[PDB]
Structures are given as structure tokens and as C-alpha cells.
A paper describes a structure:
Plant [name] catalyzes the sixth step of the HBP, in which imidazole-glycerol phosphate (IGP) is dehydrated to form imidazole-acetol phosphate (IAP). The MtHISN5 subunit contains a four α-helix bundle sandwiched between two β-sheets whose four strands are almost perpendicular to each other. In solution, MtHISN5 forms a homo 24-mer with octahedral (432) symmetry of approx. 110 Å diameter and a total mass of 540 kDa. The dimensions of the MtHISN5 oligomer did not change significantly after the binding of IG2, indicating a lack of major conformational rearrangements.
The crystal structures cover the MtHISN5 sequence starting from Gly77 or Ala78 through Arg260/261 (chain and structure-dependent). Both cryoEM structures (unliganded and IG2 complex) have been reconstructed from EM maps with octahedral symmetry, and therefore contain 24 identical protein chains, spanning from Ala78 to Arg261 (IG2 complex) and Arg262 (unliganded). The corresponding position is occupied by a water molecule in the unliganded cryoEM structure or by the imidazole moiety in the MtHISN5-IG2 complex. To this end, we studied the cryoEM MtHISN5-unliganded structure in the Caver Analyst 2.0 and Caver 3.0.3 PyMol plugin (Chovancova et al., 2012; Jurcik et al., 2018). Most of the tunnels are distributed along the 2-, 3-, and 4-fold axes. Larger molecules, however, could permeate the inner cavity of MtHISN5 through the tunnels along the 3-fold and 4-fold axes, which are approximately 2.5 times wider in diameter.
Numbering used by the authors:
A (entry chain W), B (entry chain A), C (entry chain K), D (entry chain L), E (entry chain O), F (entry chain E): 78 to 261
């Protein structure tokens, strides 16, 4: 079983993250951003990962500093759990429909960080969550994990449906890339 | 050491401000606007100034009256600390990058107030802070300090990055203008 | 194990080609076009095929006649190795990301030749290789193998990345079409 | 004196790189790309760095693989020479004129990689050097060094002048960011 | 101390010019064009140069012949004072704000003459001075001094403010280029 | 007989140039750029000049540095051969047709350098010669000779015809300007 963990203390945030690639879908997420916790639970259920996030920070100013630090910690823990990446598929593709929304995700674990972001979120706030942080979350994740990620939206009107369809497609594409190849 | 202070009591706000131009970066800022306190801390760290702000006011209506009165007090304290402005550079230029954002600041301490504002902030709120108050803050500062200030944005998408890059470039351009010229 | 071979002698070129569909990724390619050899190696590694190409020709005039004859020989050897095509999937789909580039390939082995080509290569030369020969290579391959092939580009700026992402997606889509179906 | 070195052996390239930040401008560059060696010499002379590059590779196919591997090695050696980055300016700005060309460079050493590229090179080849590799060189450098880099062109017609003005502005902006701050 | 002088007698003008690069700002300018004398005084004060100009000519026809001959003499005296240009920075950059006006100047002392002029002066006369002579002054200066000069305007409405901001930025950029570099 | 010579040694090029204005058309040109030698021969035959150029340089990088240094040496040798320019026409005009191409050249020897370039060369390479160097050649020639030169194209499609018609018109216009005026 491949397991990654990370702990970082700064002047703004305290974050502890644990990821298990060979899991059954256990989700224990508790940060100061309730909507981000809803998103991280879908990554565990649809990807069959074990995700544990504990974070506290200066949310009285904004959610920006907490959102950025959580994404960096998840990316670092993913890199250490992967190790040498020998015998894995390294490629993942998935399209996820959610009512009127449809998002396609293509990723490859290569060591070269790149993000291709094409999303059109109509509203500025979903709950208390600022929708500009969706791009910032995925940009910080690929900078520490060294992955190439492409996200494209084909349809969608509702802000909740578009974002939560994106996390479903990312979880299942990451699962396919991390499974061992059966060779011939 | 050049030190300026100001104290003003009105029917809406009570403000006390202390500025030291020859400092080491001590920041003690406490008003009713948490995001403005985050911005004023960067002016102390990047500009090597000592900034102390204490303010209370009618924030139950809006942040407008408190934001305006703090900016006027900072400008007045800056003017008294400068004094005769003899032997100083009087000019400052700096461009500050922050991820995808890039802001250039040009200022000159001449006694003639003028503001050139060219910023494109995409969202209406960052946290609880209204983004229309960024222009109002800098307009009130140059009216009491008598400075010529130009702000121009070359790139940027994130609202937090654009504003906080502006304060970094302003702090380092003000620091260069207040240093003593070495002559030949 | 399904193995195909071909040998053709004309007044311009001499070509010998051997293909093994049940392979481990052995690549032995030696023609007069170094960039084409780089492309054919990726088909062996990503598709788990055994590819052997030996060719000599009148490269002092152009690479056109050598490039065309190699593609025809590969298509003929593929057809003979497939045989009756009984019990195979016959369909393959894959999207391959390579930094900023993203290419999708859809193919089906039906006996009816058709090529759908949608690529936008910005430069005229990559090394010494003429970029007009990428279309000519795939058109000659489907004319002798009798396959329906669709290629579409979604993003990309670098000429090397776009072409070499196309060969990766073609290799993995061809591999999926040639595997035996497990039925129920 | 801060010195960084790197050695990487792959199936395509062999690269050894040595960088000294406290140097006098010694340049010893020898790869398979003569135009890149001309560019790396200007970084030593204008930046007062000591740069040593030795590389061999499969240039018979293209210059792509050699150009990419050299840029990655330089970025890694720069990161190790910087160390904790304590007491340095961390910011650099410079505009460099070269006849009709004018390029501005803004950089900051923060640990977050980002590239802003705005160049308009009119021709496809300068000598034997492919002009698409100028972007690929700077993208690979910031991915391993963790720096934020912005490049903007204001004028220029000649391809040689535009590129070689870019390297002059980058060298002097990097020099300013690596000097120790004098504090008060 | 580096000092340059020039004396030229033609059928239209008599000009004597003396320039000292290591000065304290002494200005003694007396030609037949009062507005040009106002401009040359700012070059001495802001650049810390010693400038002495004495000229008489056929101003009853136009100011063209006198303006052209003064600029040629200043450029020649600057070249002789520079000498071998060993140990100097050779590069200068400055942006100067003057109320609503903002002008940026970039120069380099290389021996190759080039002028990049981008100014938008709204009126045809400032006092008795023809505004077409601003371009003619700087073109004649770079032809005799062998310098590369770029001038760009970012804002401005008043003709007096735009021109006199240009001379301020040119003086401080020339001062930076002529100072001795401190090396490491 | 008016004869000019020049010899310059730099770190990149070694150039020796000899020009005779009262000649019979002897051409002895040998540099590392064969197409430039073809152009310089037409200047001797059509202008009745004696031109001798010997140059070696770092052509393994590019032809840029060799092309620039040859043009500077020719311009300097032309200036010294002219001397006081007493009794000469100082003006030259010629239009040269070459099949479908037609180029007009107007020049005047005044001591004030200026280049007016209006050419539309359709291709990027003629042989191994980069077509961007045609402008760079004539710009460097007028900077050292102090001449005013205007070049305008009225028709033409073939790259070889357009360039070689330009050199024919320049040679005959320069010949007319250097002949002694017969007065009344
Ligand atoms: Mn951020
Ligand atoms: Mn939901
Ligand atoms: Mn107000
Ligand atoms: Mn912040
Ligand atoms: Mn053909
Ligand atoms: Mn490759
Ligand atoms: Mn690459
Ligand atoms: Mn060069
Ligand atoms: Mn004139
Ligand atoms: Mn004035
Ligand atoms: Mn040049
Ligand atoms: Mn010819």
C-alpha cells in the first residue's frame, strides 16, 4: 500500500494531510472551508482513495491562504506515495455528466507540471466559497505533484453542478493512471 | 529618525496612526477591516517601515467611513515625517510580480497631489472587503501627503494577487524615494 | 502470436518491414529519415508492439518517396497479421496530453479506408523533416490496412510536441482495438 | 561563494552544468547547439556569473531534446546555489535596448513557478536554431528553479537582436535579485 | 574628472559647448531660444552635470538652424568626455512623472546610433518654441554621440509637462549609465 | 585617385577592405558569405569601382556578425576616400529594372546619416543567406559613411531579382554622386 503524508506550519496556516492510493473510500476532511470539504469527499468516494485533511488558518481575512496551502500539501503527499511510478498506466481520461453539466479531464504523470484550464463558472459565490479559488486549487496541486492536467467544459449552467462534476472526473482519471498495468 | 503621528476624532471614527520612516519592519495594525490590516502589514515588511494603526468606527453600516479616515491619517503623518525633504531622492519606481499578476508603480514627492489609477479588479468582494475601496484608499492618501502617484496593471486575473501586488510595489517605490541621495 | 512482414523493391526504394502484435516493445528502426525513426520507436514502447523497419532510397532528392513507401509497407503487414479479426475489440479511443498539446485518436478496423485529419502544425520543418509528410504517412497507412481513422487536435503550440503526441495516442488506440474481447 | 552543479544521464543526452553566483564572468560553454552557446556567454558577461555547460546528445534528430535538458540542469543548479535565500533582494527588473529592439524582464525568486512569455520573433530560423525553442528554454528553467518570470517585448524587427536582448535583460535582472540587501 | 568641449563656426551659427560629467549641477546656458535654455537647466540639476552653452545665430528666420547646431555640439562633447567607456554601467533606465504626464527613457552607450521616438505633443507652440524641434534635437544628439535611445509616453495632456518630463527622465538615465560600476 | 582602406580585428571577425573610386571595375571579394560576394561584384561592374574585401569570422553560429562588420568597414573606407567632397555632384538618382522587378535609389552625401528602407522580399532565404540581413547591411553602411539613402520598390516577385536590382541602382547612383561637376 502506497501512503503519503505531509505537515507544514507557516505564519498563516497549519496543515496535516494523509493520502492512501490503495483505499476503500474513507473520507475524514475537516478544514475551515465547508464547501472544499464537500469536494474532497467526492475524491475519496469516486476515486476509492483514503483522504484525511486537517487544517486551521486565518479564515477571518479570506479563504485564499487556507485554500492554497491545502492544495500544496495534497500534491506533495501524492508525489511521495507514487514513488518510482514503475508498472503503472500513467495516463487517465474520463468525462463526467452531472445533469446539464459535462466536464472532461485528461492527465498524465510525467514530472513536468502544466495546467490547462477551460471552465466557465457563471456566479461569483457558490455558498461562502469564492469561485476564483477553483483554478488556484488545481494550479497549486500540479506544481507540487509534477503532473500534466487538462480540464475542458462542454456544457453546464449551474455553478454547483459544474464544479462538482469536475472533481468527479478528476478522481476517476487519477484512479486509472495509478492502477498497475497488466502488460500482455 | 523621522517619525509622524496623527489623531483625529469625528462623529463616525476614532483613528490613531504612527509611522517611522527609519524602521526595521515592525507592524502593529488593528482596525475593523481585517483585509486592510493584511495589506498594511506588507507595507511594513517590504518597505522596512514601522506602521502602527488603531481605529474603531461604525462598521455596522459600511467599511467606507473607516477606510477613508485611515487613509487620510496615514497621508498626514507621512507629510510631517518628511519635513523639508532635503537630500532625498524624491523619486521611486518598481514593478512587482505576483504569480500571473504584474503591477508597476511610479511616484514622486513634489507637493502637488495627483492620482493615476489603472487597475482591473474582476470581482466585487475579496473577503468581506469591497473592491471599490482600493481606489478610495489611494486617492485619500495623496490628497493629504501631496504626492504624484501612477499605478498601472500589465497582467493579472486573481483579485487577491492583483491588490496585494499593488501594495508591494508601492512600498518599495516609497522606500526608494525616501532614502538619502549619496550625491557624487 | 500474430506476425506480419512485407518486402517491396521499386526503382526508388527498398523496404523490409516486420510487425508483431503480441510483443514487449522491441524497436529496431533504421531508415534514411531520423525523425521518422524517433516516431516509430514510440509506437513500439506505448503500444507494446515489436516494430522492425529497414529502408534505403533516394533521399538525395527528397524524403517524400521513402516516407510514402514505408507507410504502405506497414499497413500491408498490419493487415496480414490481423487475419480474420475474430474475437477482437475492433475499436480504440485515446486522448494523449504532452505538455500544452492534446490530441485525440479514434479508429476502427472495418475494411473500409477513411482518414479524418485535423492537425495544425505551425512550422514547416521540425528538424530536416518536412511537416507535410505527417498527413501523407497516415493516408498511405489506411489505404493498405483498410481502417477508419480520425485525428483531432484540441491544443498545442510546439511542433515536436504535437506530432509526437499524435503517435502516442495512435499506438494506444491501436493496442486497444487489437486485444481479444473477454465477452461476458 | 555560492556554487551549484548538476549531472544527469538519460537515453538521449548527457549534461554537466556548473554555476557560480559570485563570479567575474568566466564563460566555458560547449554543447551541440552553437547559437545557444552564444546566448549563454552573454549571461556570464552581463550577469557577472561563472557558467560552465558541457553537453552531448542526439542532435542528428533535432535540437529539441538537448535544448530541454540543458535548461532543466541550469535551473536545478541555480536552486541549490541559492540555498535558504536569506538576506537577498529576491526581486529584479531591467529593460535592455539593442538597436531597434527593447525587451523588459521582471522576475522574483519565490518558490512558485510561473512564466509570462510575450515575444514576437518574425523568422523561423536564426542560424540552424529553431526559434520555437526560446520559449521551451525559459519554461524548463522556471520549472526546476521555482521562479516567477515575466518577459515582454516593446519593439524589434531583427530576430538576432530580439533574442539576444532578452538574455541581456534576464542576466542583469537575475544579478539584482541575488545581491545581498544592505538593510538600512 | 571627464570634461568635453566643442566649438563650431558656420555661415549660420556660432556655438561653444562645455560639459562636465563629474559635476554638482552648475547651469550656464545662453542661446537665442529661451525655452531650450529652460530645458537644458533641468539636465544639469537632475543629472548633476555641469552644462555651459553659448550660441548665436540667424533666429530672425527660424529657430531650426540654431536648435540643430546646439544638439550636434552637445553630442560631440559628450563622446569625447566618455573616452574609452571602461568600467561604466553603459545602461540607464528611468520613468519620470510630472502631474498627469509620465515618460520612460531607456538608453545604452554602444557606438551605434539609433532613436526610438514615441511622443504625442498636442499643441504646435509652447511659447515661441516650435514643438517639431523636440524630435530634431534628440535625433541630432544621438548621431554625434553614438547612442541608442528609446523614448515612450504613457500619459500626458499638457505640452509643457510632457516635454519637461522627457528631459528629467533623460538626465537621470544618462547619469546612471555614466557612473562607474562597483563590480562585486 | 581616391582610395580608402580599413582593417578591424574583434573577438568575432577579421576584416580588411579596400575601395578605389576611380577604377575600372576590378572585383576581388572573398568572405564567408557567397551570396554577399555575388552582390559586391555587381557594385564593381556597374559602378566602375575597385572593391576588395577579405573577411573571416564565426559563421558557424550565424552570418549576422560577419555581415555587420563588412558593412561598417566599407562605409568607413568610403568616407576617407571622399575627403573634403569638393567639386563633386553629391547627388545621385537611378531606377534599375530587372525582369519584373524595379527599384529606385536616391542618395546624397551630406554627413547626416539616414536610411529610408521600403522593400518587400517574399522569401526568408535566397540560398543560405538570410533576407533580414539586407536591411542590416545598408543601415550599417550609412552609419559610418554619413549619407542619406532612400530605397523604394515599385514591382517585383522574385527574391533574387529584387535584391540584385537594388545593388545595381545603388552602384550607379553612388557613381553619379562621386563624379566631379563640370560647372558651367
Ligand atoms: Mn495565491
Ligand atoms: Mn453536491
Ligand atoms: Mn468617501
Ligand atoms: Mn496575501
Ligand atoms: Mn506521394
Ligand atoms: Mn521527442
Ligand atoms: Mn519538450
Ligand atoms: Mn550576437
Ligand atoms: Mn534640420
Ligand atoms: Mn517648467
Ligand atoms: Mn546587429
Ligand atoms: Mn544574379
Amino acid at each position: 500500500a502506497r501512503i503519503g503524508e505531509m505537515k507544514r506550519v507557516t505564519k498563516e496556516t497549519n496543515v496535516s494531510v494523509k493520502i492512501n492510493l490503495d483505499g476503500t473510500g474513507v473520507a475524514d476532511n475537516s478544514s475551515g472551508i465547508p464547501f472544499l470539504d464537500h469536494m474532497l469527499d467526492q475524491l475519496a468516494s469516486h476515486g476509492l482513495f483514503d483522504v484525511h485533511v486537517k487544517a486551521t488558518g486565518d479564515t477571518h481575512i479570506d479563504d485564499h491562504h487556507t485554500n492554497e496551502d491545502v492544495a500544496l500539501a495534497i500534491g506533495t503527499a501524492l508525489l511521495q506515495a507514487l514513488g518510482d511510478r514503475k508498472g503503472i498506466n500513467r495516463f487517465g481520461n474520463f468525462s463526467a455528466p452531472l445533469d446539464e453539466a459535462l466536464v472532461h479531464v485528461s492527465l498524465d504523470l510525467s514530472g513536468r507540471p502544466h495546467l490547462g484550464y477551460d471552465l466557465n463558472i457563471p456566479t461569483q459565490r457558490v455558498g461562502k466559497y469564492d469561485t476564483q479559488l477553483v483554478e488556484h486549487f488545481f494550479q497549486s496541486l500540479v506544481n507540487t505533484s509534477g503532473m500534466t492536467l487538462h480540464i475542458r467544459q462542454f456544457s453546464g449552467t449551474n455553478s454547483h453542478h459544474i464544479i462538482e462534476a469536475t472533481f468527479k472526473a478528476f478522481a476517476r482519471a487519477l484512479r486509472q493512471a495509478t492502477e498497475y498495468d497488466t502488460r500482455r
